[PDB]
């Protein structure tokens, strides 16, 4: 019965990302995963 | 609701935002679907 939207507008629109040797991950849980909001942002060279 | 797009009943037709400012992903792409039917039917 979870209804809170997922904070997906926090990683794709980031200003500066982490380095290669210090890659950071974000814990995502207790939300509704709506992946339809990702296609309208920008296409991706690799979507495997 | 029959002819009022104001309330929750929205129009099912939406327009694109094709502009040269938008990069790849939002650009228009022409698609040609060459439907082929190869079977025992007489070929013309």
């Amino acid at each position, epitope marked *: 019965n979870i209804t809170n939207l997922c904070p997906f507008h*926090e990683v794709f*629109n*980031a*200003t*500066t*990302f982490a380095s290669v040797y210090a890659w950071n991950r974000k814990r995502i849980s207790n939300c509704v995963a709506d992946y339809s909001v990702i296609y309208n942002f920008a296409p991706f060279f690799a979507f495997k | 609701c029959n002819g009022v797009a104001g309330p929750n009943c929205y129009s099912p037709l939406q327009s694109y935002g094709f502009r040269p*400012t938008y990069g790849v992903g939002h650009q228009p792409y022409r698609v040609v679907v060459l439907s082929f039917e190869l079977l025992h039917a007489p070929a013309t």
Partner: antibody
Amino acid sequence: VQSGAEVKKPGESLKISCKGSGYTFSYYWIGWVRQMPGKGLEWMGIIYPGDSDTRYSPSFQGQVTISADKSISTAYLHWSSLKASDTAMYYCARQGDLGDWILLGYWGQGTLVTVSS
Amino acid sequence: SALTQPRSVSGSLGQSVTISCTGISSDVGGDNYVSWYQQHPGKAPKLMIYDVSKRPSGVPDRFSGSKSGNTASLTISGLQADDEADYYCCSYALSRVVFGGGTMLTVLG
């Protein structure tokens, strides 16, 4: 140096400009930030010298468009169906090699558009 | 979120002043997306403090910042007569530019 602000009525599609120097208009982001009398700065959007991947503010998605000129390195703005609350001091800012792409390294002069009838 | 800033401050010549800045958000990639701008009354704004972990070029060393959670502070020393100007903190962690409520620096003497 910037162009003057002529008194216009809401709905005449006025235009503002700003002149910058000291860089190459090739790969440096550039945008416009307004300032209404009595409030702080308000960022609207930016434009890229190449592919114009313009990213407008959520409060400025359909209120103002960027029409900067690349051949003369002079920025321009276009409006349509203006309002009385559009009077603000528009400042032209660029990316600059100081910070990131969204960081504003330099600023323009600023012109206060006056709207009256 | 909206950045909260004091409307008016009261400094002094030779003393220091700390301008508060709350409501700063953060995204994946860092939390130092804090920058300050110096705008003189009726003049053109100039970049003064950005990336408080570093020091900008041309800006005097009497300007510095700090970070403490979601609240930032702008430490300014050596207040003079020409230092009277507007200051605004900016946050660009989510690729969106936001400004504070406006700060007016006043000095006594």
